[PDB]
Amino acid sequence: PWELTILHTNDVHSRLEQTSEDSSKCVDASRCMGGVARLFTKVQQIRRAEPNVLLLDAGDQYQGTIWFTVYKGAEVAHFMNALRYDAMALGNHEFDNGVEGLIEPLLKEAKFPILSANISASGPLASQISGLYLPYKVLPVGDEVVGIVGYTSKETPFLSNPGTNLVFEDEITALQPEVDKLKTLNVNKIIALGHSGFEMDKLIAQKVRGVDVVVGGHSNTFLYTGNPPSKEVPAGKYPFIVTSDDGRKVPVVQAYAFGKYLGYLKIEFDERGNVISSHGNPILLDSSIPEDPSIKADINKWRIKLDDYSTQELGKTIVYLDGSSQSCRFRECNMGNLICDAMINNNLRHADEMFWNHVSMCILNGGGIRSPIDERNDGTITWENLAAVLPFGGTFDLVQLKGSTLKKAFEHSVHRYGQSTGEFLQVGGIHVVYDLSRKPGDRVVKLDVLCTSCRVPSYDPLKMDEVYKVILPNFLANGGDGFQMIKDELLRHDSGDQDINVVSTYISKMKVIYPAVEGRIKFS
């Protein structure tokens, strides 16, 4: 039998440096995890031990820390090249800076193939981008070859900034002819590597004939066989076995996010490329694995420009930015309005004639606003200032919530009002009125929301059965601050851009800001 070791990462999201256990800034180095220097050590060890190894990335290296803000993907090409990745699939966040911000730096500087079989281009863009990403690549491994076929979320236009040329086709529709073509070319071992989420990965494994293994991403899915090694709770076994329409057992793998784990799957193939067995588990990249000294020194050199950038003026405020708890946990505060306005601006995506924008609404836990910003330093705002306001390393995510769920969230926002607790919500595109003399659970007396399916945005009463798109912190989408109804009742959840980066980009665009308290939240 011919044995292949697949090493894989996904949704690394700019975690070039080692992180804390929750993937935020590393504080106590002796307990930090991940980072490319530590990944290098582990990949190198495995490559000494196993003859046939592929190192694959399932997309979403772009977006997540100041590394991406400053280097804009050059850091991804550089450090993925240093790790000698064998292939990468395009994720949604690879389009965050447009097709131009993908072509340069990433596609032109990567030394490995970058893959997606379900993205097509038209017009001059088609000639400009031709061959810079590929539907698949056939790679030599030892004396054999392995075909790797890529895919990218069909929902990317709602989750990034790909522009209006590119078309994202249905994954299974695009993948099947490519896999059948590879069979006709005597390629009998085929990995589907792509960025659509665990649920789509399972459908691909079931329905795309000829796929031997699916290596996925997007949903930050943690899979494990046995007692998990850290705090992440598995969604299923590793690999997750799908029975294909033609009776084969097809392993599906993912490796959480943020570079905390290295996926590791061993597959045994027979001479005809049939899978005999598959087993493995993600490896927790904890501090027992040393950071490679040379990669670490390179990381530290690249960090200089990040430190320099962090104190540069992004823009100016002419108003005090009130991010105090005494305001933001008790009433509408202008820092909350600013952040929610930045959240909505970040989520402006190309729209049909059916909506002015696909999302208009924002909620933000006031306890997640951690500092004011004083305007008396010549109005200057720096990244360092914003990192004091938003220190948790979160993202501003997109969810779909029924109106009934959102109303329950606003009741939860004030269910124990008066104690300076974090669940009090700041808002955008929502006007709420509370009557605190009513019983907890019945304190929301008016709740109006900004329309999306309208050419002139205006407010209408919230409807209990209607499903609304809302931008909110990952922390809330995951049920933080007691918002269990959000986690349990949401209909869709996609991870968005880094919290600081969302606000920094908006301030830079606006140049001079003056957010007011304007009646988004009132008390009767």
Ligand X SMILES: Nc1ncnc2c1ncn2[C@@H]1O[C@H](COP(=O)(O)CP(=O)(O)O)[C@@H](O)[C@H]1O
Binding site for a copy of itself (CB under 8 A): 318-320, 322, 334, 348, 351, 353, 356-357, 375-376, 431, 450, 455-459, 509-512, 514-519
Binding piece for Ca ion, criterion CB under 5 A, among 38-46, 59-67, 270-278, 385-393: 270-278
Q: What are phi and psi of 114, to 5 degrees?
A: -120, 130
59 binds Na ion (CB under 5 A): no
Which residue type does 473 have? P
Tell me the Cα Rg of the chain: 24
Report, in Å, the least distance between residue 479 CB and a copy of itself: 31
Nearer Cβ to ligand X, position 158 or 475? 475
Binding piece for Ca ion, criterion CB under 5 A, among 198-206, 222-230, 272-280, 410-418: 272-280
With CB cut-offs between 5 and 8 Å by kind, which of Zn ion, ligand X, Na ion, none does residue 473 bind? ligand X
According to CB under 5 A, which one of 133, 151, 168, 198 is a site residue for Na ion? Answer: 198
Tell me how far apart the alpha carbons of residues 69 and 71 are, in angstroms, rounded to a whole number. Answer: 6
Angle between helix axes 74-82 and 293-310 (nearest 10 degrees) is 170
Binding piece for Na ion, criterion CB under 5 A, among 78-86, 109-117, 211-219, 272-280: 211-219
Near ligand X in 407-436, by CB under 6 A: 422
Near ligand X in 285-304, by CB under 6 A: none
Nearest to 284 by CA among 30, 16, 35, 24: 35
# residues contacting Ca ion (CB under 5 A): 3
Binding piece for ligand X, criterion CB under 6 A, among 187-195, 336-344, 360-368, 447-455: 360-368
With CB cut-offs between 5 and 8 Å by kind, which of Na ion, ligand X, Ca ion, none does residue 481 bind? ligand X
Q: DSSP characters for 14-25?
A: T--S-B-TTSSB
With CB cut-offs between 5 and 8 Å by kind, which of Zn ion, ligand X, a copy of itself, none does residue 519 bind? a copy of itself
Asked if the peptide bond before residue 239 counts as cis, ω within 30 degrees of 0, the response is yes
Query: How many Å separate Cα 497 from the centre of its chain?
Result: 7
Nearest to 157 by CA among 172, 173, 171, 169: 169
394 binds ligand X (CB under 6 A): yes
With CB cut-offs between 5 and 8 Å by kind, which of ligand X, a copy of itself, Zn ion, none does residue 11 bind? Zn ion
Q: DSSP characters for 147-212?
A: EEEEEE-TTHHHHS---SS-EE--HHHHHHHHHHHHHHTT---EEEEEES-HHHHHHHHHHSTT--
Q: CB neighbours (10 Å) of residue 305? A: 13
Nearer Cβ to a copy of itself, position 352 or 488? 352
Report, in Å, the least distance between residue 219 CB and Zn ion: 8
According to CB under 6 A, which one of 365, 382, 498, 504 is a site residue for ligand X? Answer: 365
392 binds ligand X (CB under 6 A): yes
Report, in Å, the least distance between residue 120 CB and a copy of itself: 22
In contact, 379 and 317? CB cutoff 8 Å: yes
Contacts of 228 (CB under 8 A, 6+ apart): 222, 234
In contact, 333 and 369? CB cutoff 8 Å: yes
Q: Which residue is nearest to Na ion (CB)?
A: 197
Report, in Å, the least distance between residue 160 CB and Zn ion: 8
391 binds ligand X (CB under 6 A): no
With CB cut-offs between 5 and 8 Å by kind, which of ligand X, Zn ion, a copy of itself, none does residue 394 bind? ligand X
491 binds Na ion (CB under 5 A): no
497 binds ligand X (CB under 6 A): no
Tell me how far apart the alpha carbons of residues 152 and 147 are, in angstroms, rounded to a whole number. Answer: 17
Question: What SS3 class is residue 504?
Answer: helix
Q: DSSP characters for 342-387?
A: HHHHHT-----TT-S-S--EEEEEGGG----B-STTTTEEEHHHHH
Token look-up 């836990």 returns: 365
# residues contacting ligand X (CB under 6 A): 9
Nearest to 361 by CA among 396, 413, 334: 396
According to CB under 5 A, which one of 11, 17, 171, 212 is a site residue for Ca ion? Answer: 212
Report, in Å, the least distance between residue 189 CB and Ca ion: 5
Nearer Cβ to Zn ion, position 161 or 405? 161
x-or-dash pattern for Na ion, window 219-258, by CB under 5 A?
x---------------------------------------
With CB cut-offs between 5 and 8 Å by kind, which of ligand X, Ca ion, Zn ion, none does residue 60 bind? Zn ion
Nearer Cβ to a copy of itself, position 322 or 494? 322
Report, in Å, the least distance between residue 447 CB and a copy of itself: 14
Tell me how far apart the alpha carbons of residues 280 and 507 are, in angstroms, rounded to a whole number. Answer: 46
Contacts of 467 (CB under 8 A, 6+ apart): 400, 401, 402, 403, 491
368 binds ligand X (CB under 6 A): yes
According to CB under 5 A, which one of 180, 199, 245, 460 is a site residue for Na ion? Answer: 199
Q: DSSP characters for 87-119?
A: EEE--GGGGTTTTHHHIIIIIHH-SS-EE-SSE
Q: CB neighbours (10 Å) of residue 21? A: 16
Q: Go through 1-12 and write b for each residue having 16 or more CB atoms within 10 A of its CB, e for each that does not.
A: ebebbbbbbbbb
With CB cut-offs between 5 and 8 Å by kind, which of Zn ion, a copy of itself, Na ion, none does residue 185 bind? none
Report, in Å, the least distance between residue 358 CB and ligand X: 25
The residue ranges that bind Na ion (CB under 5 A) are 197-199, 219
The residue ranges that bind ligand X (CB under 6 A) are 365, 367-368, 392, 394, 422, 473, 475, 481
